[PDB]
Each structure stands twice: as structure tokens, then as C-alpha cells.
Swiss-Prot record, chains A, B, C:
Source species: Escherichia coli (strain K12)
SUPFAM superfamilies: Porins
Gene transcribed to yield this protein: phoE
Record's bilayer topology term: Multi-pass membrane protein
Subcellular location: Cell outer membrane
PROSITE patterns noted in UniProt: GRAM_NEG_PORIN
Gene Ontology CC terms, in alphabetical order: cell outer membrane; pore complex
Entry protein name: Outer membrane porin PhoE
Amino acid sequence: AEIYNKDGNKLDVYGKVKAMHYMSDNASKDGDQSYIRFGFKGETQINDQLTGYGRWEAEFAGNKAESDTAQQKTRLAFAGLKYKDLGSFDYGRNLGALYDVEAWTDMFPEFGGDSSAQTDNFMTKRASGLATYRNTDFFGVIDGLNLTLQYQGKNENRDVKKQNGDGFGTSLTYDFGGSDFAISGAYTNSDRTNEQNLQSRGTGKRAEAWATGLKYDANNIYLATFYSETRKMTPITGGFANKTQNFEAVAQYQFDFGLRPSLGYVLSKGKDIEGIGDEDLVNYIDVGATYYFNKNMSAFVDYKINQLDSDNKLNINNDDIVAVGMTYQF
Amino acid sequence: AEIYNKDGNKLDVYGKVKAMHYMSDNASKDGDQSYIRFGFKGETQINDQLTGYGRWEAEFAGNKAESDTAQQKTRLAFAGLKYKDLGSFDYGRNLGALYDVEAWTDMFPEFGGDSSAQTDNFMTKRASGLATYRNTDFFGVIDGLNLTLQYQGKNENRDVKKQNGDGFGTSLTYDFGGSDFAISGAYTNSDRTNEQNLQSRGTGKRAEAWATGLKYDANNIYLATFYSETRKMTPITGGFANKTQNFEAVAQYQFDFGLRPSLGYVLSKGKDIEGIGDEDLVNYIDVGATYYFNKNMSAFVDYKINQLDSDNKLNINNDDIVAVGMTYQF
Amino acid sequence: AEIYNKDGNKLDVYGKVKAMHYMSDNASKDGDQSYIRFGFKGETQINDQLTGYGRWEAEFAGNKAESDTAQQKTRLAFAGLKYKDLGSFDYGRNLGALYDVEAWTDMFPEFGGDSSAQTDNFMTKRASGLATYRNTDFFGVIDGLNLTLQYQGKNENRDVKKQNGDGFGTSLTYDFGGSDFAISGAYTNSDRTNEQNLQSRGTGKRAEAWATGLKYDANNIYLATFYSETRKMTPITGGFANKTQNFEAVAQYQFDFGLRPSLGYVLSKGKDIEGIGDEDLVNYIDVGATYYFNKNMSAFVDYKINQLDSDNKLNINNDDIVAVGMTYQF
């Protein structure tokens, strides 16, 4: 909600209470997982052609006792400039380049974005240390095309899963539509940090990933799907997976009254693992729906139908989960 | 302060800096205990008869070095709907059912709400995992009556004091007044979680509590009092108290100029403790006052006169405390 | 940004995303150190002569993984009253008295305020437990003079570096100007806490500090400088420094277009250290500049030229650092 629009500055305070319960056995555990979001975002307008902005998004736990003050964590912190027509540059906590792809099917009521996309995993989902250029429609009219170059500074304070060396990411998108249609691909080659190569699995030199996505979003239908492959990036109980192939798909329909059913499927498949062969990393069908009471209030049910087996060589968790909830947001 | 009231949505950003000092010896320790509160709350109006809301309240420490980033904790997170006349349903971090009672005398400048009401202690004070129905005036005119049914999902991540199994809570309230008068009672039976019954004290099967309160709030006087009993819920240095009886009372007068004296007394009495017999759990007189400069600014002094003895079988703390402070709030 | 100015109350929500990168070796480390600030501040007006306020400022990390929820910390929490002409009293997390001095040259793009001023170091920089009276222009016209008396309650929960006993602080400032001119001095004598005197270095009885500053801020030039001395307050790897002498200087020029170069130098010199003699504690030249796009958006480069030696008896860090960034703020 735009709480300030004065003298060339627009403050926008946003947020969401997601009261939310998981009923299930202990895969991604069960019981309450409600949370609150909070964020501002400014846009100061320097000149009629230039603009600057900062965005901040934190996330505060809903489910802990108040004695567990290990409760908030930030999601987005950046601030940058955008010139009329030349595009936008920014730095700070942001979204890697491959997620320009993987977002196409990250629309479930709750589950999903679960495959190749780990958070604080080099440029795959959210990420620290990112300079980002994004050009749009291409300088002089390839209208529709959209471009991103990004650099990520090394991050080796953190846990060994969470670390990375200096790297790079592109992606592009061309849109069209009598109604609406788009295709997308991205590229990452971030080298791996030294301390990480003292590990059991996926040891090596560089860490790449690439993806491709097709979407269709028109006259209330939404469909999207993408493939992705990673070489030594995805974290594995042994150590980072040598390779993986991941596939996501999504079909959703929004009724006029408010109901919005979603179907989607998530597969992540471990490959050439350094002592276990190939076990799958993620395999479930998602069935669910939210009901949009309006822009602000909503309620949902989601059902992860884990499709993974019991004899699972990486001793993962074959347990279904059913999330139910209402989401107020302003 | 209602910072947004547009297109059927009212954002209300609130908060309070309580700069506050305890002078005392080390019972609930001494020195600074100032804190800050911050919360929004929305109310989107779907239709002329329905409404939805979310409330969030965190609490950020005032007193630590900045090197002790163990500093914030959330108090309320929920979001729900309310239909004209049928009442309100919500889920998330909220207030148990017995606190519909114990609030009657939780009005001191600082101390109190200290008896049967522990925070993250099954539905006794604040609490995680709560679905809550509250009906008011009873559907068709018992005007004055007010009703609450609540369910609390199991919470066993947390510390053993802090855990609980699935449970239930009712309370009701009928109001009246030529000026103002009300009576209240509530009920809880949450079963105890398995890991908790590996304890020394108050082991068992179910954990109940019940309370009763009378209040009088009219032409500037305010008086209220309540009894409460718990079976294996209140945390004890040995382990949860087998039973307890707790009594609170409060007399307060608000002058026209701004001064508001308060008298109150708090007694919590351990019963059938599993190795110590019965020691009291809380016994103090509270004398104090706030001066309301206005809606926003205020200042106070409170004085807990601990009435507990020295030879205290549960080795509690007989030490007085005197809190002084000013409270800005918006 | 003043988001509320109604019925005698002005809420002011502020904040800043400082996306920011250090390139360097590991002195104050290297890579991302962007952060976000957030604060409100109220001012309720009781009567035409009196006013009350609260200020709160937290600071949330930009650079950690979201798995390291050790991320926010508060900077300012207080709330007080100010009477027309008699001055202002407040309590809570605030700025000691010596910092009324040391602020004169704490203006770099990033570095500086680094000498005698440690945060949560008795009244030297930010600080917990502070009652503060500040009188201004002196009751009856010494216009220009400005006065501060402050008391700091003991703080012994915290780490031994971070602790302190009860203490006191004055400072005064007289301003003038055909353009602008001022001189300042402050005094602290906080006794040291008992647990702290079980240390190797700077053991003793009382902890004093004093400072002096001259500034010149006119027709776009800004120059300022100050001396400071501490007896057993500044933390040393062995233990608190017995004495120190610290000197800061700053020359800055603001062009009409927006560029604002800064020169400054920081020296902190350990004296009579209890096993090491005298090594310097801080010695660097700072060269840098911010470009102010406007009130809100800006970008900078700073360069700490560490001037400290390698054979450094307190095994400190002779490594340069170069900070680059943009700052959005509202």
C-alpha cells in the first residue's frame, strides 16, 4: 500500500500474514508455519528520465515460542537506478538469473520453486552479493525481448552449502500475444569456493546451471513448464550433486468468482552421485487452490502428493503434506 | 495510527517505546528493560457483510548491546474473517481462552498477568497454533453475552516447558450496566505432549485449567478479580505444577487531570508438588500509577512489594522491584 | 518521511537500503556489507509549551544467508519530553555525551567515528541505560550555547568489553557565524564494573574520557577536528587500554552538481599498555566521495588507506579497504 507519494518519492509499505497450518508427517514438518512479511520500497525520481529505488523485504516467524528470538530473516535488500530506456542497475540481496526462468512455475498455493532453485545457492533462487543489469525491449525496439546480466560476489562467510565464489548469469525472455505467450532461458558459471571442495560429494572446479521455460498466460488460463540442469551446485546430504535435471510444470485456471485451482508436478533427479548412483531429489504432484476473496484477503488448501520412494538411496521423505490457510495482505 | 483508509482497506501502523528502568535486586533483574512495540493491522472489507483482517505485533529489545542480535520476538500473528452478525474466525499466534478472563486484572503500570497466565503455556496467555471462533451478543439478541471456542494445534518443536498437545478452550462473558458490570469464566483441556511426561514434576495425561472473573468499570472506577486453577500446566522448577490456585485483584481510579493510581495483589499457590509439598508460586502486592499526559505520551512508577518468603521451598525470590518510566506511543 | 501529521501527532517512518560492497583483504572483512535501516519517530504535542517523543531505529543485515537469522539489532530506543525553553529529558538506548564531540568528524562516506568512539562502550558512541538532559541556548539567552548532562545506569548483563558501572557525562557547545563556527568539549567518569577488573589489561577503578572539537561548516565547506583521551575504557585485545589519545580530522566540499569529496585522517594511540608498551590502535587516511543524486538516492566510493604497521605489537591489520555503493533512503 502506497503510503507516501509526494515531491517525487513513492513509499510503499507492504506485508502479509500468512496464518497457515501443515498437517502431515515430518518431511518439511507439521503444525503451524504461518509467517508475516513486511517490506517497503521507494522510487525517487531524479530527473524526468532517471529513477532510483530501494526495496526491502524481511520475514518474521509466526510459529516459534517468544523465547526463540531466532525469528526474522531478510529476503530482498537492494537499491539502484533505472534510466529511461537504457534499463536498470542495482546491487544487494536479490534474485539470481536462473530464477527469471524458474518463476514461470513457482505459482503453487504453497509448495513448488523446489527443484533446481535453492535459496542462497549461487544465483539459483534468492541470493546475496548481486550487481544486475536488466535491459528491456532492447534499447531500440526489439519490443518484447528482455535482458539480464548479473555478477555475484563470492560469499564464503556462511555455511559450506551456502557458499560460492565470484560468478555470472544471463537470461532472456521474448514476449508476444494475441492473448499471451513467452519463452525463456538463463546461464550461470559461478566458480566454487575452496573450503567447499573439502567435501565428499560433487567436488570440483566450477558450478554451472542452465534453464529453459515456456509460458502461456491468457484469458484466464496459465500454463508454464521448464527444464534446468546443474553441475555441482545443488546441495546433497553427501555433498553438492554432480549433476541434476529438474522439470517443473503448472496448469491453473482462475474462475470469475475467485477460485483458482492449480496443478503442477516437481521432479529433481540426482545424477552421477559420488557413492549413491542416481536417486531423485524431488518428486511430487501438487493439487490445490486459493480462493480470492479480493486483492487482500484469501484462503487456500494445498496438497503435496509425494511421489518419491521409500527405499530412497539418499534417505529423503516420501511423506505427503497438506497445507491449509488464509492470507491477509495489504 | 491509521496510516491508510482507501478502497475498502484500513492499515493501521502502531507502536510504543517504553523507556523503562527497574531498580531492584535480581528477581526479574534490574536496570534497563525498555522495549519498542511495532505492529500493523488491516481490515479489508469484502462485502457489506464480510470482513477480513490480519494483525501483527513484534517486540524488539531496548536493553541489549547491539552485538546481542538475539533481540526481536513476535507476539501476535493472525488473519481471519468476520461475518455481520455470525462472528469471527481466525488462525495464527494469538491469545488463549483463559486470557479472556485473566485480562480483567492485568492492568498494572508494569507488573501482573503473572499468575496462572504464562506466555506459550497451552492457551493460558499468548499462544501459537490457534483456530478461534468468537460469537458476540449471541447470533439473535442475547445482547451482552460473548462466546469463544478455540482449538490449539500441538506444539512440540519448542522447549519442554513451552510444549503442548492438541487441545480446546471456551469462555463466556455477559455484560450489563447502568454504568458498567460483567462476569466471565473459561475452560481448557489440552493433552500434554509425550516428551514432557519424562519429567520430575506434574507428570500425567491431560492438562486443564479453568477461571472465573468479575469486573466493574464505571464512572472512572475500575475494579476486577478472578480465581483460576490449573492441573499440570504451570511450569515448576522441578517440572509442571500438579495443581495451583491463583487469585488476582485490581482497584484503579483515573483522575480528570491524568493520574491513574492502581492497587492490585497477585497470589499463585503451588499445590501437591511432587517432592516439595505446597510452596506459593507468586505473592506480591503491586502499588503504582501512570500519568497520562494524553493518548500518546505517559510516565509511571510501579512497585512490586514481594510478599513471598525467604525459606521458599521452590527457591523463588522474595525481592521487591520498582519500575519507573515514560511510554511514547502512536 | 512524515507519514502522519494529525491531531497533534507526527509520525515519521524513515529508512535506508545501503547496498554496499567492500573490496579488500580481511581487516573489517570484504564482500557485501549492505544493510537496511528502519525507524519511526513521533512527537506528540501535549500543550502549546510541552512535547513528547519516542524514536526507534533498528538495523537489519543485508549480507547474511537467510538461514543466519542472527540479523537485526536496534540502535536508538528512547522517549522523552521537551518543555518550551526549559529543554529535554529522555531515557533509553541513545548517544553518550562524548559523541556530541566525536560526531563533528564522523562524516566519511563509510569509514571513521572509529577512534575513541566504540558502540556500547560507556557513553563513548551508542549506549544503553541513558537518562539525558539537554538545555539549549541556556534558559535565558546565552544564544548559541548548548548543554548536556547525562547519567548511565550500570550494564553488566553483556560481554565484559560491553559492560559498565553507573556513570555521568557533560558536554557543551557554543555556536556562532557570519557563515558558521563552533567549539565543543565533553566529560565522562563511569566507574568500571567488578567482573571487568578480573582482566589482564587496564584494570582499575574508574573509567574516564574527555574530548574537544572545533568545527567550521559554512558556504559549502566543512572542516572539523577533535582530540580525545580515555583512561581504561577502550577495549584492547589484552584488555581495556590504560590510556589513549585519539585525533580525528575532516575536510569536505560539496559541489553544486552533487559531488561531495571528503578527506579525513584517524589516529588512535594506545598508551601504557600492560604488557605491550604503546601500539597505535587506529591509523589510516580516508579519501572518498558521495554523489547526491538528490535527498533520497546517492552512490559513493570510500578508500581507507591504512597507515598502521605490520610489526604491530597488538597484532592489528594493516590492510586497506575500498567501499563502493548506492544508498536509497526515504
